[PDB]
Amino acid sequence: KVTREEVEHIANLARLQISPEETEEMANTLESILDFAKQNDSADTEGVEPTYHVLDLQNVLREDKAIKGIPQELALKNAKETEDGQFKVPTIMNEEDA
Amino acid sequence: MSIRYESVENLLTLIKDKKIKPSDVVKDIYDAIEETDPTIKSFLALDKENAIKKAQELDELQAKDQMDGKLFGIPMGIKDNIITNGLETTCASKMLEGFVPIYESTVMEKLHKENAVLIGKLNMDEFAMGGSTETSYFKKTVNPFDHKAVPGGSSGGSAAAVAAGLVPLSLGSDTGGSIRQPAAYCGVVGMKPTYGRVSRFGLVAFASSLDQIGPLTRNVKDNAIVLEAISGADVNDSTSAPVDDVDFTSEIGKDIKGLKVALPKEYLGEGVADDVKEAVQNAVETLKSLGAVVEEVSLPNTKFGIPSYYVIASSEASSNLSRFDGIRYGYHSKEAHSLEELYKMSRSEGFGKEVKRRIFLGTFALSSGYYDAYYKKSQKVRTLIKNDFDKVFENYDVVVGPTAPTTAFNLGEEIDDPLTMYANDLLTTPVNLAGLPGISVPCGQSNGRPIGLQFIGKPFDEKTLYRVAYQYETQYNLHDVYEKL
Amino acid sequence: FETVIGLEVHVELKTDSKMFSPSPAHFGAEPNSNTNVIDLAYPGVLPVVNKRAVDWAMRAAMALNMEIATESKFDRKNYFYPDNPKAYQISQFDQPIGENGYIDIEVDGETKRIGITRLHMEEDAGKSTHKGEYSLVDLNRQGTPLIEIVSEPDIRSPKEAYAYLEKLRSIIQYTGVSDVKMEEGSLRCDANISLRPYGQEKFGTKAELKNLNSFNYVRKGLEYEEKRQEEELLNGGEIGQETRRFDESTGKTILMRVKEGSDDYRYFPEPDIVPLYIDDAWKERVRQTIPELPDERKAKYVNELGLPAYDAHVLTLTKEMSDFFESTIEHGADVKLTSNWLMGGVNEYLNKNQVELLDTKLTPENLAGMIKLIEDGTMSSKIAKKVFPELAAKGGNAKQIMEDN
Ligand SMILES: NC(=O)C[C@H](N)C(=O)O
Ligand SMILES: [Mg+2]
Numbered sequence: 001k002v003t004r005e006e007v008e009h010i011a012n013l014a015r016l017q018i019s020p021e022e023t024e025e026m027a028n029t030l031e032s033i034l035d036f037a038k039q040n041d042s043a044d045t046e047g048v049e050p051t052y053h054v055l056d057l058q059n060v061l062r063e064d065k066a067i068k069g070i071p072q073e074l075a076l077k078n079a080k081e082t083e084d085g086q087f088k089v090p091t092i093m094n095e096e097d098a
Numbered sequence: 099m100s101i102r103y104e105s106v107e108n109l110l111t112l113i114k115d116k117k118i119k120p121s122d123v124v125k126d127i128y129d130a131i132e133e134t135d136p137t138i139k140s141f142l143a144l145d146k147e148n149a150i151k152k153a154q155e156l157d158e159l160q161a162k163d164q165m166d167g168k169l170f171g172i173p174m175g176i177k178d179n180i181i182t183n184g185l186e187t188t189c190a191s192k193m194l195e196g197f198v199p200i201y202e203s204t205v206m207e208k209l210h211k212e213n214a215v216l217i218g219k220l221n222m223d224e225f226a227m228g229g230s231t232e233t234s235y236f237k238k239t240v241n242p243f244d245h246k247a248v249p250g251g252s253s254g255g256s257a258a259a260v261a262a263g264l265v266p267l268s269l270g271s272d273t274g275g276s277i278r279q280p281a282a283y284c285g286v287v288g289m290k291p292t293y294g295r296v297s298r299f300g301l302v303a304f305a306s307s308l309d310q311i312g313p314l315t316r317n318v319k320d321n322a323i324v325l326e327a328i329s330g331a332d333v334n335d336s337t338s339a340p341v342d343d344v345d346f347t348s349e350i351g352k353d354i355k356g357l358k359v360a361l362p363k364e365y366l367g368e369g370v371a372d373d374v375k376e377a378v379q380n381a382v383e384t385l386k387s388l389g390a391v392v393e394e395v396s397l398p399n400t401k402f403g404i405p406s407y408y409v410i411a412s413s414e415a416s417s418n419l420s421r422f423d424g425i426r427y428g429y430h431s432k433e434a435h436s437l438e439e440l441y442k443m444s445r446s447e448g449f450g451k452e453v454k455r456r457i458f459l460g461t462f463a464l465s466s467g468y469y470d471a472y473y474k475k476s477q478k479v480r481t482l483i484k485n486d487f488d489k490v491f492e493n494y495d496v497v498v499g500p501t502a503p504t505t506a507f508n509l510g511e512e513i514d515d516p517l518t519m520y521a522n523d524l525l526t527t528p529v530n531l532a533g534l535p536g537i538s539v540p541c542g543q544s545n546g547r548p549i550g551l552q553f554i555g556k557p558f559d560e561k562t563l564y565r566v567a568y569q570y571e572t573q574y575n576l577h578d579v580y581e582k583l
Numbered sequence: 584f585e586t587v588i589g590l591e592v593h594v595e596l597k598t599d600s601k602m603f604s605p606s607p608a609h610f611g612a613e614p615n616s617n618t619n620v621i622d623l624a625y626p627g628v629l630p631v632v633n634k635r636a637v638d639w640a641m642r643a644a645m646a647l648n649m650e651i652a653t654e655s656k657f658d659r660k661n662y663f664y665p666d667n668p669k670a671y672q673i674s675q676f677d678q679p680i681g682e683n684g685y686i687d688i689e690v691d692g693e694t695k696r697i698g699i700t701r702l703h704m705e706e707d708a709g710k711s712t713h714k715g716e717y718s719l720v721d722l723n724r725q726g727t728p729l730i731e732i733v734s735e736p737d738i739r740s741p742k743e744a745y746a747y748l749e750k751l752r753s754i755i756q757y758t759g760v761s762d763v764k765m766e767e768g769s770l771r772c773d774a775n776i777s778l779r780p781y782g783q784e785k786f787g788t789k790a791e792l793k794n795l796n797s798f799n800y801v802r803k804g805l806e807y808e809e810k811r812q813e814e815e816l817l818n819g820g821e822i823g824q825e826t827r828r829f830d831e832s833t834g835k836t837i838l839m840r841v842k843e844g845s846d847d848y849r850y851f852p853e854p855d856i857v858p859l860y861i862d863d864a865w866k867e868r869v870r871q872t873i874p875e876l877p878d879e880r881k882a883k884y885v886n887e888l889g890l891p892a893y894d895a896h897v898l899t900l901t902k903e904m905s906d907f908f909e910s911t912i913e914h915g916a917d918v919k920l921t922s923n924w925l926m927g928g929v930n931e932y933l934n935k936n937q938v939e940l941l942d943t944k945l946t947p948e949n950l951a952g953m954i955k956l957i958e959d960g961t962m963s964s965k966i967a968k969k970v971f972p973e974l975a976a977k978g979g980n981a982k983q984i985m986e987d988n
Pocket of ligand 1: 273
């Protein structure tokens, strides 16, 4: 029972634009895959610790020695919108469209 | 084209004996691409100009008789989710079309250090998500053994380029089988080294916990060589393992008499087709004819491989693909007038259907209310899966089985059915979940389409893997078939 | 009707390089010139943990009487923003390096032990300058090592909140891991406040106060908010979860948004960073790397060198000030006298001239003299009027200026 609501809420968390025309289609697929996810429910995990890392390495730290940043020009080279040495973005952060 | 089929090893020697000039090696490669890729379509951006220049340098070094490198005048194709500084890296996505890296990935660093020659980037499934490579925003690569079949995914281009006599070696990435399955489909040799065996600096991530770079080649030996050139530890990757011994060729040629080979019953299970199953069983008998001891075992949590894998991989993807806002690089929506729009539009328009499926699934599996039941549960199942191997490994040296349930399927046969598409990862995902090294080598053909035989090893023991793989290879291979296509 | 409030404080660690990237932690005025592929969140980049940042994080946590974790990993706090390029801030969720500690404070009443529930390592975000109907983004500061300190909700008044920030700032300052100045952003603070009428367990509305830029300023918003929801509770009020911005000019808090629930950050272990296993030896090295903190330094000024109650607090307000005072003490300066001289006189000189760099202009070596000259040599004070200033911003001995003048 993945509802129309949850779909639109996930898209927001993922920052993905979705249309009612898509939302429905997605509610269905999302569901299907989840029932694909349910298979794990037949697996017995009582007392099993979650696996976060596959290896054993421990405490890998780096020394506090700086390295000059790269040229501003390099750091901007691939951005489509940049104004005066900085990434330019909209912030008419208001109501019908934040 | 002359040497378009020389193995890395033979080509290497052909260069050191001055019987061939690096510049010509390269001419032959691009001739092959011009003639063959129109139909195969394994390549994306080519680096011809640069390749030619480096080869010209190489001629000098050849004449001055100073040829350093484990690889040297060796052409190399590279998967498009692996950063090449200066060379356009798209991940086969609209989201990155046009993107030119400004830093160099560690394996390329190593590869260049060894003097290999970068020929170009290989096509793949978008952001490494797929099992056929059909999701590519640019082209649909095809199987050199059958032009109506898929080359596998996500590293389809890497498997196809090698099988097509385009390059002697190629790099791929494997998250749940993206290196082995394509190899199995194109009847080529592909290795997904143990987790940590190869740095991920420059590997455009999907699943930090499951990803890994590895080589694809036309034979076991070449594969081992290439793995020795990209393996070591790296200060740029905290998870790169500090294992100094990288000689993987030390035992190729040694016999496997007495080798304890575990054959889990779940690998010849119900989802495995009849032809694939027949080939592997014959493969087992071949192994028996060679001294190794092969007995049945059980990896009971195998059935959960695909489901826990997708929950886990998607979840991580739901995070690793977030940097794509189109602000600093990548596709940037023109019609965006709001910051929300900028994010939502650039990502929805820049990502393909399958990628958005994973993200959606991932974000949900990770969200409040569902976290423990969907993501947490998976991580636990992951432990179950590794446990299986731990147990089996107590009494066995290696694990054998088929790489994929079936031979390559048809163009568009499953591109519209992710559920059946996913099922093809039955025998590969457990490896990544447990972090083990796994390798695929051809073991047959059914209607001309190759079948893969997979060897899973103990952590960091790829040398044994190559040893048994080589021995089996002396009894079967497609070594002389590639030349005829 | 206790007004229950807690404080979320971030501290900028002053390391050479950033938390998960070798970029320098100190940048110039040129935007986006203090970055690399890591800070810029380029595809395929990985985080590399700054060792000193960890040492300093667990140095400050001990100084905060917290239990230091043995196993501590990092986690991803996921959210989209132009200042957070990866779209996730590498932080800590479970296993924060430090837990359950406290600090003692004196509020008008007598002593109160306020608990500090946790301390975790994070990375700072970039800065987003709002220009026109657009926004400019500078990633120079992105990645700067921060540490988050969250108080137990034990605070009970806008004044206890101030006292808290002062002691905390004071203690962190002594560990030499941060200049902890709010005017410089190396110390930040957010407050959470809610009122629950006695006899019952239910609370009224709860609010997160944002844009509190000075110790003095948090109190303003805190006590205003307190009165604001004091009315709401009584008059009619509609219970709710909210975030509020404090207006520096008007002194009021403005409702900037109403929470629909709990912000979902999809926290999960950072696979790119191997776990930390902090052993005893390690804990020792950093244990020993801690001086005498303010409280025990002040208790030292009480019975031994029996100084007053006011004096003790202000002389231990900073490590440098307190060191200065003790260096000048053995020298030959009468404890009280130097005390009275630093308490006021020098303290007022510093504030009036904003010479906060107490270590370059005058010295315990130079000041030690002035106090003797006043003490026995030449007779009494009037003279100290200007001998001090010159002696503070100019020379080295005021028993050379009384003369050279
Ligand atoms: N490609 C892989 O490594 C795994 C799986 N086939 C996917 O698309 O996620
Ligand atoms: Mg924080």
